[PDB]
Design a protein around this ligand. Structure first.
Ligand SMILES: CN(C)c1ccc(N(Cc2ccsc2)C(=O)Cn2nnc3ccccc32)cc1
Ligand SMILES: CN(C)c1ccc(N(Cc2ccsc2)C(=O)Cn2nnc3ccccc32)cc1
Lengths: 304, 304
């Protein structure tokens, strides 16, 4: 027992991290096969970022201007192309540590692990979620750009995120590995405010099921509710609407605990209306929303 | 910016995880050089655990009874010895993935990363702390025994913990890599209750400094206090006493923010006395104590 914000083991991704330098800008790249993926803003100066014309800036760059270093050894760049907001640097050597991989574009509410890197070197790993406003609440400093988000299914790493920027509000924005930003963010240093950061309701319910599985049952009440009634309360508290799809995804957790999904919704409804009253659930004084129902099942069953 | 419960990259430790089986018990081992370290309770049945005589149980075991598997390949056991509560299985092959390593016995309040494993395979990585009552609040299921806690300093992995058991209260107990349990716990299925789980005061102050560095300043007040006055309040709230050593360790964070350590103690004192009032600090509704001052500096400076 015990429930922790657990990240995937990062070894498979550590073997893909490289340093990319263009001019005076150095950030991280992801080396898969003979291609190094990195944010296209590597070609920019801090001044360029105010109003960059990436196509024009890229015309002034050649293969030899992209310095790619894997460990202490230099990789030879034999091609370069811009795909949306990422650059793909074709190198003459396939990464011998390339794992089985996929590029996936995740949905808001979905969680992933981030391997924060600086100068192509991993500094740490943490678990986060794609917020409903398409930002991530990560931990990134200058130089962390190019750090990636991923999930692992046994031996296949599914890359979902590449870090590009920090908004003036301390939240983070990035792309999938095809270079498309999550949300409406652009790689330009301009006025970009995030939308409402709503709570991922299905994740909170999954975490309430994890709490019951791990012994924290004080919040279980004698009530039930309906999806419509629950959703009136969820709207009032800036919680995402709960759908029948979400109820269905919670089915295995509902079956394991013997607590019907709508009964747990009534528990959540009372927690929203009355607060925790100075009490905690799984060592937290707030309702955790960065564990999906899949994460709760995975952690409670020990999938390796 | 942003502050996350960050674990070290686990790749270096993933390359050391092996499966050890003795009879019908299978748990994890740590393979460093030509030695596999694992909990000595691998020789026990669930019945044996009630009152095990490890020396007597070990007499009935030979080298060939310890099945060590690294990936899908079997390791040949050429020696076995019991050191305190761990077994050291000498194998005929040095682990080619052995990193630079040390075995350290940590103090309470110190943090480390855990790579949770099952059948020698890593399932996840999370950050935790050695509690002042010598337990850890981890996430371990049956089969997780032998999973290790560690810190990394650039390229040297310092192993500090090996998982052995879960107490009836859902908290975890284990040893250092010399086989000595942290605290008064024994590898016997008997009445073992943990002592007071006090809050690691120096860590809370470090995390309050991280909050100021990352923009959360609402809790900063117009007051100061003394170590003696602060400690009267800390005792009342089951917080560890703050010493001059702790003040000294907080010096670099105090210098970076320009907030004297005792002023932050007064902030913490008001937070203890008045509560958060429905507010949060770094997205938490309680005072986080599982980041050391070293962790805060490391995360805020990006040490790789
Ligand atoms: C010189 N170039 C290449 C460059 C200059 C600025 C940046 N920006 C600013 C920005 C804002 C909107 S568009 C660009 C980042 O946010 C980068 N960033 N990512 N995470 C960070 C954590 C802290 C500080 C910085 C951070 C990226 C690249
Ligand atoms: C059959 N053998 C070898 C064996 C049998 C029992 C155990 N015990 C029980 C115990 C309590 C005090 S002394 C032994 C564990 O706690 C093991 N453990 N570790 N973490 C876990 C998370 C969940 C469930 C089990 C867990 C270990 C080994």
């Amino acid at each position: 027992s015990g429930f922790r914000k657990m990240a995937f083991p990062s070894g498979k991704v550590e073997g893909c991290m490289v340093q990319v330098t263009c001019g005076t800008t150095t950030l991280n790249g992801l080396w898969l096969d003979d291609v190094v993926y990195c944010p296209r803003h590597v070609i920019c100066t801090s001044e360029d970022m105010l109003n960059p014309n990436y196509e024009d800036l890229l015309i002034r760059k050649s293969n030899h201007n992209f310095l790619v270093q894997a460990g202490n050894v230099q990789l030879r760049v034999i091609g370069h192309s811009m795909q949306n907001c990422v650059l793909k640097l074709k190198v003459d050597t396939a990464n011998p540590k390339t794992p089985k991989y996929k590029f996936v574009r995740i949905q808001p509410g979905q969680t992933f692990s981030v391997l924060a890197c600086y100068n192509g070197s991993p500094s740490g790993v943490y678990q986060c979620a794609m917020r409903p406003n398409f930002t991530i609440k990560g931990s990134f400093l200058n130089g962390s750009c190019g750090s990636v988000g991923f999930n692992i299914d046994y031996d296949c790493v599914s890359f979902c995120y590449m870090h590009h920027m920090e908004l003036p509000t301390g939240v983070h924005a990035g792309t999938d590995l095809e270079g498309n930003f999550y949300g409406p963010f652009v790689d330009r240093q301009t006025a970009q405010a995030a939308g409402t950061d709503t709570t991922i309701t299905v994740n909170v319910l999954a975490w309430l099921y994890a709490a019951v599985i791990n012994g924290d049952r004080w919040f279980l009440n004698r009530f039930t509710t309906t999806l419509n009634d629950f959703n009136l309360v969820a709207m009032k508290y800036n919680y995402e609407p709960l759908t029948q799809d979400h109820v269905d995804i919670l089915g295995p957790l509902s079956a394991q605990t013997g607590i019907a999904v709508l009964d747990m919704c009534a528990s959540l409804k009372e927690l929203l209306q009355n607060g925790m009253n100075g009490r905690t659930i799984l060592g937290s004084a707030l309702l955790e929303d960065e564990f999906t129902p899949f994460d709760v099942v995975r952690q409670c069953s020990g999938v390796t």
